[PDB]
Amino acid sequence: KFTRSRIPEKVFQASPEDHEKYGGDPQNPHKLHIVTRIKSTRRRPYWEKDIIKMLGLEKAHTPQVHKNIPSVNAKLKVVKHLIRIKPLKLPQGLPAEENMSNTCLKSTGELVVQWHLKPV
Amino acid sequence: SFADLGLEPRVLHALQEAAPEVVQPTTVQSSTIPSLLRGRHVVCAAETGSGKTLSYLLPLLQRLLGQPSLDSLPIPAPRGLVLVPSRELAQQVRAVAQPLGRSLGLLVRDLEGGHGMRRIRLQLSRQPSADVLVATPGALWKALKSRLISLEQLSFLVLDEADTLLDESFLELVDYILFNPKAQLVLVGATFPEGVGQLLNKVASPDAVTTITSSKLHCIMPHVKQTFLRLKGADKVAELVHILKHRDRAERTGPSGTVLVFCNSSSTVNWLGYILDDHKIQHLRLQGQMPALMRVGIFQSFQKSSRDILLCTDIASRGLDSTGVELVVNYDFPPTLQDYIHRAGRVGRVGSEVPGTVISFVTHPWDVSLVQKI
Amino acid sequence: RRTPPLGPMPNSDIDLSNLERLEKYRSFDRYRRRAEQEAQAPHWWRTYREYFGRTQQLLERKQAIQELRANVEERAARTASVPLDAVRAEWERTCGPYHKQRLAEYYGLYRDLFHGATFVPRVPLHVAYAVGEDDLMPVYCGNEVTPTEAAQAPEVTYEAELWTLLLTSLDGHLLEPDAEYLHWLLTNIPGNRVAEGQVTCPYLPPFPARGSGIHRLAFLLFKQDQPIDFSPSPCYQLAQRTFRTFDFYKKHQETMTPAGLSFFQCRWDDSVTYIFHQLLDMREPVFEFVRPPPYHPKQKRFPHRQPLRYLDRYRDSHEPTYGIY
Amino acid sequence: QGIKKMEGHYVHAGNIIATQRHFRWHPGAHVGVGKNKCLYALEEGIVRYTKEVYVPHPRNTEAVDLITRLPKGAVLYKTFVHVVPAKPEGTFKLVAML
RNA sequence: AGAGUGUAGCUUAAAAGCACCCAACUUACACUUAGGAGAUUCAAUUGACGCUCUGA
RNA sequence: UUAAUUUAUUAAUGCAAACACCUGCAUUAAAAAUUUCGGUUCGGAGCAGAACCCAACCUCCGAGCAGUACAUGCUAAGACUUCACCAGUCAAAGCGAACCUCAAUUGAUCCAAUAACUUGACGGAACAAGUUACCCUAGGGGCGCAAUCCUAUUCUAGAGUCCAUAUCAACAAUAGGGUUUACGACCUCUGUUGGAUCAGGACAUCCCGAUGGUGCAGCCGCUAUUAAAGGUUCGUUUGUUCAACGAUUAAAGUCCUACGUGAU
RNA sequence: CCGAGCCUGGUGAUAGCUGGUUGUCCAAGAUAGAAUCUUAGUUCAACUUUAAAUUUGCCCACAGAACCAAAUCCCCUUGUAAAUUUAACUGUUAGUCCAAAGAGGAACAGCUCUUUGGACACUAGGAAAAAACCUUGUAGAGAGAGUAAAAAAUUUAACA
RNA sequence: ACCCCUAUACCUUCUGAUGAAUUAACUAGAAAUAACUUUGCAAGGAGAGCCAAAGCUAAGACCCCCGAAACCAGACGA
Ligand SMILES: [Mg+2]
Ligand SMILES: [Mg+2]
Ligand SMILES: [Mg+2]
Ligand SMILES: [Mg+2]
Ligand SMILES: [Mg+2]
Ligand SMILES: [Mg+2]
Ligand SMILES: [Mg+2]
Ligand SMILES: [Mg+2]
Ligand SMILES: [Mg+2]
Ligand SMILES: [Mg+2]
Ligand SMILES: [Mg+2]
Ligand SMILES: [Mg+2]
């Protein structure tokens, strides 16, 4: 009987060796997370299909993001096996309305304050 | 097994007396007995004569053991009641209850219409009050209308042939009988048609259901061989006579040739019985039109298996637990497939062990029953 | 399924092996007493209440009882006079507080005026309403006086030596509910002299509206340790007289505890209307005490088997007619 | 037979509450009954059931004999049907200011 | 000599309720009605007066 | 067609109608005509002496009755509804009151009467055979040899308590039955009662053997145990395992074996 | 053409039986049960879909759900967008295969028969060929680019 | 031009095998009751009736083709 099946809480239990292996720290978590699809909407639970629909993941291999709330955490972990998340960082400040236009996303995590036209 | 039910020493000794026919409880009996001993109001559909009456009675005996004798004061009604649709079924139930209550303290009584009401309403029958009483609905309704019995004193009710008790002739008298509503209600049957079960829902509150065997149309017993009559009705009785000639072989070997014939109409049963008695067959006929004393004598003879050929009307299709039932002929195929299956389960009522022969005649109205035969 | 009792089932332990060894309710009063003892318990299967609800003095009393028995002997019993005046005086002296608290709870005076916090009145206070010269109308806890006889200010007796007497109608007349209409305000009374204390609010007559049921007016005196200031002169304004006793007792009566209370009923009368017209200078209101009306059944297309009363329910009355003249 | 209206259902006065032969249903607050041993509403409000000990009237002598036959520690208990009135009896409304 | 100690017979009563008995109706019993008899062992939380048990 | 049903039509009768002929009505046939041949009776006393019940083509009194009536008040919310109405019912609050005899004396539905009220002797579907190896349209699927069965069996692996060879037996293997399948188209268009026979098995033994008790002196018996090692006849009536008849016998016991045994 | 001559009318006879039934473009839209002289058909049954009228649904967290395993249902928030009554017609119901759960038969089988989940009778790339395995989903052109699934591995008998 | 690379003939029962040599011409949805939409009038509507407690009149839209063997009358055939 295939179902939305139970998985342990240890799947979301990190390790200090893991936090070193990953780029994460136990303190000061991420403010917003990003997500993407790299697996088929086909051949999973239809419940999970509408879950990915709820995720705004009707595109695929395209970026999207949300606020990584615990409810959002559970929603993502429901469809985690098909999806990927990213620590959608922003080393600079958040985009002010004065700087409303010049923003972008560099895949390592950067949100651009001003993506100008000349190099460094 | 039976010891899992915590039977009393009288109950354990009676169960040991039921050996080798009872060495352990049946699986349906295992499912039924302690849940009833849990006091839950429920209905159980299972094999006829599968010890289901004993499974209901053992938990009833345990519940009556927890009941005080002070409710057994004079003039009141019983606390343990059972219902049967036929006087013969009620008499058989009362006879079975009197064996178990010989080593117990429960008083067992029977009530049915067409019998002596002086003995029914006797001072040691109605007024002294009993623990176990199996009663027909008509006699009980007459007693309640005449204040010869009560309904506030009941504590454990059993509905045998509850589907037959759910008959349109039988539902109104049962509802009139329906009375303390907190009593523990248990119903027993062979199968539950849906249109009657919701009728139970008219007087139900979170009950339980215990079903046995296949959940589909459990038409064919694995221990019963069945045949289809590929011939017209005109010589079919003659073919039945030929089957009687075949039953002549069954009369030859001593392997018991107790034959039960299904007849739809009492007058048709009388005509067929006059033909068979004319045909030098040792046949006895029981019907709803038979005299009550004559029916009682015929039922006692069939209990003794005195008449190897016995015809039965619509009054005697289901519920039968007859020893040595080896020959069953639906001389008239039953108008209900449930009725045909119930007549089939009436024979070989010792369980999955005692074998028997089944032959059913086929008529034109039963042509649509051929699809039911599929 | 099968629902048994949640708590202990009745008649379970008293069964035992020997049922005939039970004492049995030989007397019907014994069974009634056992049933009342059970009914005092709240039980676990719910009920109607679930949905709706010194040695020297003893020796002296024993000597007095022995003397009374010797005076009777028997012969006086075979019909003792037992005067109720001395009995009432001794009851007011000894056990008057519990009965007074019970009466105050029954009248709802502590729950309404004081917003709860009922207390046993230590000081026995009874009022005497001046009706002519002789006699004076006695007002105990709950004694009823009409507004006609209650035109003038009444006297009070408590047999005590500061004090503060007040009078409030807890019925909440005229204005909004959860309020009491003040009638008199005596403060800093030295000793038993009520006139020694000042009178802030002058005494006004009762003004119960017509057909408004019965009104509850209570006069209360509280034990005062030190005299305190107050505040309203003789006024007929209803806004100044509107004050709750709970608020006054909470944040103003800090060093003050109750001592005595006397309750009375008030109904509409000629003097109430006279005070309304002359003193209040306003029209007297009258109340109806009207019950709810019938729901009236559902109207269908045809009356079916019913009589002629089916088609005449939901309008009014007596002479209406056809299309048009 | 049986209970016509379940407890908690709002019912007008005179509506059939519970009908039974041999009194399985007993009377609580505001529950009328006639010669048919049936319970009916006597007021508008919400119906409730309560398991309270039943004490028969002194007119019933057989019931008195049965209660005497009950033990001194025996308690009867019975399911009575109370009718809590939802609406009040009436209210006083200011007629006129004469 | 030591322990337990203490409201009439009984009370996880603080001077009450169950119990006692008398009558009348009872063959008798029971109920009821009329009755009355009934106890915190004494001195300042402490002591002894009274009893049971363990000894001699 | 003796399935069912008629009988349009004849032919007879008989009855009508008219004074041998015609018409009408019944019955009977002949002949027809219309339609069927499915699927996978009831009580009191005793027997029955002290809670029930209890039996007799048991012992005695009785019953199909008779007599005596028809607050069993009024008012009044709110409900059930004969699936309409009519007819019927339940019932709160109020006014006015309390606070059948018999001993049995009977019975049931159904069809009746009766407009009805009332009066009469534990479950109640509309019905029709057999053939088409001629049906009709339409749907569904000798000669050659031994590849196969084949047996005077070799090596003996191995079972057979041991022991390959008392017996069996596999792998491969000397080979060669014309009885079985085709290959080539070689001369061509689950049967049945007795009986006969043979009988096998059981004792629950008819007799015989050995005993115990006996209302066993003895002869004859009866009962009970043990004993299947043995037998338990001949004929007559009738095909009947039974039954009647005679001569018998120590006894003429019983059944089972497909109520044994017909691939004669 | 004799198994009942031939022909004309009646005769557009009749069976629920097969097959075929004509140009375009937008909006929505694929498998549950019960009766039936019935499974080659039809009727109660559900879904829809549309037209109108009326404001919360799907995903869930606590508590709770029985005596004779996965679990499942009622189920605050979260994210996201549709849900309840009234009506009309049609249309599926004889589904295939795969992973799990049972019953039967050899525990043969592209065999049967009920519950859960998919896709599937509908595009493209790859497994050699490809109704079912993996990726991928949804519109056009460009002679750019990133990416996904992606070709089988493999060998031995030393001893004091 | 072809040889270069991709490329399981069409229509259809199916769940994944019958027909069509090829042209050119013929050959196969019409019953409006209800409801809706759009017009005219309005407590009346309409060129006697029918219906109306917002209706009544006008129009619009749903309904194949091929294919049995049968049977009866009336002729005609040796
Ligand atoms: Mg239903
Ligand atoms: Mg089914
Ligand atoms: Mg009711
Ligand atoms: Mg034609
Ligand atoms: Mg046609
Ligand atoms: Mg067809
Ligand atoms: Mg049918
Ligand atoms: Mg039929
Ligand atoms: Mg069919
Ligand atoms: Mg085409
Ligand atoms: Mg061709
Ligand atoms: Mg044709």
PDB file of N, CA and C (backbone and C1' of nucleotides) and ligand atoms in Angstrom, chain B residues 364-365 367-368, chain F residues 125, chain G residues 36-37, ligand 8:
ATOM      1  N   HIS B 364     -40.025 -22.924 -13.774  1.00  0.00           N
ATOM      2  CA  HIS B 364     -39.984 -21.734 -14.619  1.00  0.00           C
ATOM      3  C   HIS B 364     -39.827 -20.437 -13.843  1.00  0.00           C
ATOM      4  N   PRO B 365     -40.541 -20.213 -12.733  1.00  0.00           N
ATOM      5  CA  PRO B 365     -40.317 -18.998 -11.936  1.00  0.00           C
ATOM      6  C   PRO B 365     -38.900 -18.917 -11.402  1.00  0.00           C
ATOM      7  N   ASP B 367     -36.396 -19.783 -13.065  1.00  0.00           N
ATOM      8  CA  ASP B 367     -35.492 -19.589 -14.191  1.00  0.00           C
ATOM      9  C   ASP B 367     -34.557 -18.414 -13.958  1.00  0.00           C
ATOM     10  N   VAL B 368     -35.091 -17.300 -13.450  1.00  0.00           N
ATOM     11  CA  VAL B 368     -34.253 -16.177 -13.054  1.00  0.00           C
ATOM     12  C   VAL B 368     -33.337 -16.552 -11.899  1.00  0.00           C
TER      13      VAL B 368
ATOM     14  P     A F 125     -49.270 -15.992  -2.791  1.00  0.00           P
ATOM     15  O5'   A F 125     -49.518 -16.729  -4.184  1.00  0.00           O
ATOM     16  C5'   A F 125     -48.458 -16.927  -5.110  1.00  0.00           C
ATOM     17  C4'   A F 125     -48.065 -15.636  -5.783  1.00  0.00           C
ATOM     18  C3'   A F 125     -48.643 -15.383  -7.164  1.00  0.00           C
ATOM     19  O3'   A F 125     -49.994 -14.963  -7.178  1.00  0.00           O
ATOM     20  C1'   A F 125     -46.352 -14.943  -7.227  1.00  0.00           C
TER      21        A F 125
ATOM     22  P     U G  36     -32.852  -8.810 -10.611  1.00  0.00           P
ATOM     23  O5'   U G  36     -32.960  -8.709 -12.193  1.00  0.00           O
ATOM     24  C5'   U G  36     -34.012  -7.973 -12.794  1.00  0.00           C
ATOM     25  C4'   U G  36     -33.703  -7.645 -14.231  1.00  0.00           C
ATOM     26  C3'   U G  36     -33.354  -8.819 -15.125  1.00  0.00           C
ATOM     27  O3'   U G  36     -34.505  -9.517 -15.561  1.00  0.00           O
ATOM     28  C1'   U G  36     -31.891  -6.988 -15.549  1.00  0.00           C
ATOM     29  P     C G  37     -34.694 -11.068 -15.197  1.00  0.00           P
ATOM     30  O5'   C G  37     -33.834 -11.825 -16.304  1.00  0.00           O
ATOM     31  C5'   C G  37     -33.991 -11.526 -17.684  1.00  0.00           C
ATOM     32  C4'   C G  37     -33.968 -12.778 -18.529  1.00  0.00           C
ATOM     33  C3'   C G  37     -34.487 -12.638 -19.955  1.00  0.00           C
ATOM     34  O3'   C G  37     -33.484 -12.185 -20.854  1.00  0.00           O
ATOM     35  C1'   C G  37     -35.450 -14.554 -18.917  1.00  0.00           C
TER      36        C G  37
HETATM   37 MG    MG I   8     -38.609 -13.328 -14.665  1.00  0.00          MG
END
